[PDB]
């Protein structure tokens, strides 16, 4: 009877994988046909040629890991006009262009995983930290990297930041900044990255130079960092569970389908997820007010280590 369009940044990835699979199967146990698919590879093109194809082909909602966050609007404005529900998870849109962003965390959340897990391996009052992540101008890491700089100011005062540098979400360029921090600060007593590429970098940086004790945090996918996690070189990481992410997603987008949208302050009770509740957009940097449009935050992020790593696949 009804269509949910599920899109990922570009499909062949985990994460993305993943995530589509907790949507479809949301979907199923919902009576309602999810359709995952992406672009091969990450473009504002490819992700817009989709969203039109599915509002042309009367789908009922859209939901989509945004790209770029402008670049989809038109496309994502059309559809409201047609009718179409639109949502954004992951990645999120300007807020005019979505009624819903199912959310991660917010800046003041990941920020604070990344110091407490910081916090957790460093033993020196006086330690030296380095960050690592994509580049100064990304909005989102940007976010989270300013709340955990100010968070460790706050909290950790002994700490020095010795330097923050960039690996521009390139393997190659990500290694090779990383083995650069790790051979100029032979004392330094963590590095915290959260990019899914300098994490794994940092860790490899740290076995290719034979680096012991140096504490590695920051934001990356289990598989990923599987291998660096049991060899001891990656105690702590963290990230969520992006299965759930897609099985909220289709759960608010059927509450919009079903005509019982949700306002600031509402709430909608998930099934093996609980209670979800819808918060303000200027949270996330950005305020805009309007009805039936906000933020949906996960109610838990995820911590991994040892223990847990192997209970997730992506």
């Known amino acids: 009877a ?28 919902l009576g309602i046909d999810v359709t995952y698919d992406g672009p091969t590879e990450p473009s504002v093109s490819g992700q817009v040629q989709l969203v039109n194809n599915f509002v042309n082909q009367g789908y ?13 609007c038109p496309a994502l404005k059309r559809a409201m006009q047609r009718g179409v529900k639109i949502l954004t998870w992951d990645s999120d849109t300007k807020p005019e262009c979505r009624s819903y962003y199912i959310n991660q965390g917010t800046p003041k959340q990941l920020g ?13 009052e006086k330690a030296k930290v380095a960050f690592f992540y994509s580049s100064p101008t990304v909005t989102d890491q940007n976010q989270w990297v300013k709340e955990a700089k100010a968070k460790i100011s706050q909290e950790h005062p002994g700490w020095e930041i010795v330097t923050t540098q960039f690996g521009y979400n390139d393997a190659t360029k990500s290694l090779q900044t990383a083995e650069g921090i790790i051979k100029a600060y032979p004392d330094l007593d963590a590095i915290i990255a959260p ?23 920051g934001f990356s996918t289990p598989n990923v960092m599987r291998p660096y996690v049991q060899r001891g070189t990656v105690k702590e990481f963290g990230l969520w569970d992006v299965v759930q992410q897609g099985k909220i997603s289709v759960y608010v987008a059927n509450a919009l389908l079903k005509n019982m949208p949700m306002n ?27 009805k039936g449009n906000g933020i949906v935050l996960l109610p838990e992020r995820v911590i991994f280590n040892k223990d847990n790593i192997d209970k997730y696949d992506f």
């Open 195 to 217: 990019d899914a590429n300098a994490l794994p970098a940092a860790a490899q940086a740290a076995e290719n130079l034979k680096r012991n004790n140096l504490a590695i945090v």
């Open 60 to 72: 009922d909602a859209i939901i989509v890991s945004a790209v770029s966050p402008d670049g989809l």
């Open 112 to 124: 604070s995983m990344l110091v407490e897990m910081a916090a957790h391996q460093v033993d020196k």
């Open 2 to 29: 009804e269509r949910i369009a599920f899109i990922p940044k570009l499909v062949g990835v985990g994460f993305f994988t993943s995530g589509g699979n907790g949507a479809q199967e949301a979907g199923k146990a």
């Open 264 to 290: 600031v302050g509402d709430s909608l009770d998930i099934p093996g997820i609980g209670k979800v509740t819808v918060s303000p957009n200027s949270e996330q940097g950005y305020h805009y007010e309007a």
